[PDB]
Amino acid sequence: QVQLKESGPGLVAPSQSLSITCTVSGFSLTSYDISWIRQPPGKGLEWLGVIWTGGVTNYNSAFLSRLSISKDNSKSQVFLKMNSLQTDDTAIYYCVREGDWFFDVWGAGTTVTVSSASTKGPSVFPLAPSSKSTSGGTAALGCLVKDYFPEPVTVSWNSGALTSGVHTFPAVLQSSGLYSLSSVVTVPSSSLGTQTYICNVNHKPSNTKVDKKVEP
Amino acid sequence: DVLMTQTPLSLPVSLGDQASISCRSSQSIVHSNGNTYLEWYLQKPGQSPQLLIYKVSNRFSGVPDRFSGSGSGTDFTLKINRVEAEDLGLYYCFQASHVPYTFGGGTKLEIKRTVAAPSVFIFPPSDEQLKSGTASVVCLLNNFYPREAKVQWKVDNALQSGNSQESVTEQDSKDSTYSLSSTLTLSKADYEKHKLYACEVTHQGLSSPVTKSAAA
Amino acid sequence: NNICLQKTSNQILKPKLISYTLPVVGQSGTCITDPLLAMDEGYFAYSHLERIGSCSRGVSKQRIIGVGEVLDRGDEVPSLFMTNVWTPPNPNTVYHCSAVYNNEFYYVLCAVSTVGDPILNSTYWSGSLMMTRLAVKPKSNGGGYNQHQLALRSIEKGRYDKVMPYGPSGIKQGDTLYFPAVGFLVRTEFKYNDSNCPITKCQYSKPENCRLSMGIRPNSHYILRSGLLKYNLSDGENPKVVFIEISDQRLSIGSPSKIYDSLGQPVFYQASFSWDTMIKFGDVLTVNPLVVNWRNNTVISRPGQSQCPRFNTCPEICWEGVYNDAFLIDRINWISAGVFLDSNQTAENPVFTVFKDNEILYRAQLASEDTNAQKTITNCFLLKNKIWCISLVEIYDTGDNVIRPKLFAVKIPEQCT
Ligand SMILES: *[C@@H]1O[C@H](CO[C@@H]2O[C@@H](C)[C@@H](O)[C@@H](O)[C@@H]2O)[C@@H](O[C@@H]2O[C@H](CO)[C@@H](O[C@@H]3O[C@H](CO)[C@@H](O)[C@H](O[C@H]4O[C@H](CO)[C@@H](O)[C@H](O[C@H]5O[C@H](CO)[C@@H](O)[C@H](O)[C@@H]5O)[C@@H]4O)[C@@H]3O)[C@H](O)[C@H]2NC(C)=O)[C@H](O)[C@H]1NC(C)=O
Ligand SMILES: *[C@@H]1O[C@H](CO)[C@@H](O[C@@H]2O[C@H](CO)[C@@H](O[C@@H]3O[C@H](CO)[C@@H](O)[C@H](O[C@H]4O[C@H](CO)[C@@H](O)[C@H](O)[C@@H]4O)[C@@H]3O)[C@H](O)[C@H]2NC(C)=O)[C@H](O)[C@H]1NC(C)=O
Ligand SMILES: *[C@@H]1O[C@H](CO)[C@@H](O[C@@H]2O[C@H](CO)[C@@H](O)[C@H](O)[C@H]2NC(C)=O)[C@H](O)[C@H]1NC(C)=O
Ligand SMILES: *[C@@H]1O[C@H](CO)[C@@H](O)[C@H](O)[C@H]1NC(C)=O
């Protein structure tokens, strides 16, 4: 059970500062060097910094003025702080573990968006099954998640009971500036009306967890 | 400051065929220790990057033997023979011989597969969103191989433009297929009792199906 | 032995680079870690672990334990002249080596662990130790005079489960060697009073923090207490080691320590690896009931992380810091010398520093302000009546992205101008 978990703010205003905490499990910060890597949306991976077991810190020259990396050995936490944040800075941020100058284990990443907008929870609406949504014995049912500004949202079906035939589309920013996505699950036509399907949606930045039941 | 260039931005490859990715470093990547720290990482859709090859040709623990790294000086290539579907993703080369460590721009591996036809479904707006004053009509194309596909929205029988956002999923490991959501978003008033909200799909493996909703 | 006693902006310290003497090959490209430099009389012990790759986890190429003489190299500058080198078989099993010099031999006590660093995999550690004796002036032989390993009939650890050398250097008194050490005590058996912890001037400090940070994590199975390991050469055919705990005055988590004779008396230094970040060292009042009359120093501290940074004196849960020891060089005025990383929260910028309890007297920056560095070991001695100090300083090589020890010989200046 070796894991790296990243906690971040979601939303950061331009010129203000980003702070991310990585909690590490199954290993000692003294045993292993830890590095920070970021993926810009669409764009490829970039390496920002490393903190050594001793506490020596080595950073990419470009971010040296604005970037600080720190660790708490006792609480098994590694901290990244960045300043003067700008839209270019918006990226998924990764806490990685290094063995012999290679990254053996990677955090899930935290999504950081630089924006002056406000965080806003989503509104979930049913995409109802219908004859129009039925082909043969297979039917499509879905939920639309709409109007959430911070990018990361996770959609689950039947509280994670149903993972089969599920596609969650990549989100599109609207003219509103609020993201919208549709999650669709293929289900048997016979099942509909005797089996209850409920979407579970989590938008961590707004501390939203919602259930929407989907009926025909 | 040492730059890594990956020659194929996109590689399409059939199952069981051999995929070959290139990586050039702008300088020698041999360390004083005499080890060339060139590493190859894969990012499957939805996941963090994962280590495949380190020190040019060493397979990281767990990586199957059909993955293979070679190289000399500044030219490195990764070969995937007998490509399997679960190999699709983004491939990055990486050097840690020089600080700052640097990644290559990435290579997307796409799987060539037999043409598959989309399954098309239409979803009319929930009355709940219709209480919100907005109307979203969703069209879903499921499980089609050639990504290229055209979705036409006809309100009544009028082709509509400027009101639709499309979103396509990444290739699925299991079936090597893509799925797409075309949403048409209108105001409640703009949903002026128009009947015939219809969705016309054209795909390489079809001869043009339409799915339509009579407004009430 | 007279030296400047006045604070002086003048650059009167002029250190010499004498690292060429040590067995460090820069050209190899390797990281050199886990250093040890011990000097007593005219002789020194030295040790390091040489790695190919990263310093944390590159593959071990060699562990070196060497001894030799400290000699005037020809121009009234001291250098290290290694005469006897032992490479431990199975380098990866050797941890936490400590060295004491007696009677023409240097004795190195090292932990042996097939489960990793005993501090980190402490419940699984065997507890086993190895004692190796190395002749400082070797001779052509057919057996073990130059190198041999000794039998530790017993290890008297008292209420501790495990005891271990923990720090570079120790002392001799007669035929009894005293190594800096640490005891692993089951946390549930650690008797402590929360009221004693000093949170009075600290708003965010809590009573639990001093007890909690006596381990490497609040929920560590063990706590670590510093102390000495005693080895009486004139005691049976194979003598025992006896652990001796440090007194509980100004108690901090067990950390790499050092005990050294200076100007006729033992001085103890303990690295500050948690919340009491001010330098911990002073005259040893008693050795076997180990009690140290700690300096109340208000000027010298060490860099930390965000929780226990330089100059922190408020109880906090933390295990961070760096070993930057200091060597007493004048007991009449209690002036000491050492290399300290002149930064609050980053391990950088080594500065050679001559200082009193409440005053830094003078200093030489050995590298740039941005120069990453770590462990520091200072030892002072006389050379033709001149007080000289030799400092080992781990410094970062940006070209090879590794750390390597550099040696500075620094003559303490007799005159302030
Ligand atoms: C590296 O870290 C050191 C140590 O920081 C301290 O400990 C750490 C562990 C943390 O706890 C940290 O919060 C601590 O500060 C830093 O040095 C320290 O710096 C502080 C702030 O600069 C100093 O505090 C000052 O000391 C001077 C005396 O030398 C004193 O005059 C200051 O008074 C201030 O506070 C008073 C209330 O207590 C207030 O009434 C004062 O008002 C007058 O002055 C104002 C201007 O200063 C003026 O506006 C007003 O009208 C009045 O005329 C004043 O605001 C204050 O107590 C610490 O002495 C100092 N300690 C040490 C050991 O150096 C370093 O700064 C840091 N390095 C870097 C690069 O960050
Ligand atoms: C810096 O300041 C601190 C206070 O902040 C100061 O602490 C004091 O340390 C001394 C020495 O450790 C303590 O004195 C001891 O007290 C106990 C109990 O009373 C005595 O048993 C001790 O006596 C033994 O040791 C003596 C010396 O070897 C023997 O002569 C004697 O026979 C005993 O064997 C000893 O007196 C003292 O209690 C504290 N507390 C105070 C005064 O706050 C520290 O000394 C200062 N350090 C420096 C370097 O000035
Ligand atoms: C501490 O030591 C134990 C004992 O050797 C290590 O446990 C072994 O771990 C390996 C790989 O994790 C297993 O294959 C063995 O089965 C374990 N041995 C036993 C006896 O259970 C443990 O991993 C060590 N921990 C650290 C941090 O070094
Ligand atoms: C060492 O042992 C001898 C006798 O075996 C004894 O006379 C001497 O005092 C001992 N030294 C110490 C420091 O215990």
Residue numbers in the entry:
A (entry chain H), B (entry chain L): 1 to 216
C (entry chain A): 186 to 602
Structure paper excerpt:
Nipah virus (NiV) and Hendra virus (HeV) are highly pathogenic henipaviruses within the Paramyxoviridae family, causing severe respiratory and neurological diseases in humans and animals with fatality rates up to 75%, and no licensed human vaccines or therapeutics. The majority of candidate vaccines use the attachment glycoprotein G as an antigen, which recognizes the receptors Ephrin B2 or Ephrin B3 on the host cell. The G proteins of NiV (NiV-G) and HeV (HeV-G) have ~80% amino acid homology, which to some extent limits their ability to induce cross-immune antibody responses. HeV-G and NiV-G share a similar beta-propeller structure composed of six “blades”.
One antibody, 14F8, was selected for further study because of its exceptional neutralizing activity and ability to define a NiV-specific vulnerable site. To define the 14F8-binding epitope accurately, the crystal structure of the 14F8 Fab in complex with the NiV-G Bangladesh strain head domain (14F8 Fab–NiV-G) was solved at a resolution of 2.8 Å. 14F8 bound the top of the G protein with a buried surface area of 1351.3 Å2. As shown by the crystal structure, the recognized 14F8 is composed primarily of amino acid residues located on blades 1, 4, and 6 of the NiV-G β-propeller domains. The interactions between the 14F8 heavy chain and NiV-G involve Asp100, Asp33, Ser31, Asn73, Lys75 and Thr57 in the 14F8 heavy chain, which bind Ser239, Ser241, Arg242, Trp504, Ile502 and Asn557, respectively, in NiV-G through hydrogen bonds. Interestingly, Asn73 and Lys75 in 14F8 FRH3 formed hydrogen bonds with NiV-G. The nitrogen atom (NZ) of Lys75 in the 14F8 heavy chain formed a salt bridge with the oxygen atom (OE2) of Glu501 in NiV-G. Three amino acids in CDRL1 of 14F8 were involved in the interaction. The nitrogen atom (NE2) of His31 in 14F8 CDRL1 formed a hydrogen bond with the oxygen atom (O) of Asp585 in NiV-G. The oxygen atom (OG) of Ser32 in 14F8 CDRL1 formed a hydrogen bond with the oxygen atom (OD1) of Asp585 in NiV-G. The nitrogen atom (ND2) of Asn33 in 14F8 CDRL1 formed a hydrogen bond with the oxygen atom (O) of Gly214 in NiV-G. The epitopes of 14F8 partially overlapped those of the neutralizing antibodies m102.4 and HENV-26 and were completely different from those of HENV-32 and nAH1.3. 14F8’s light chain epitope is distinct from the binding sites of m102.4/HENV-26/HENV-32/nAH1.3.
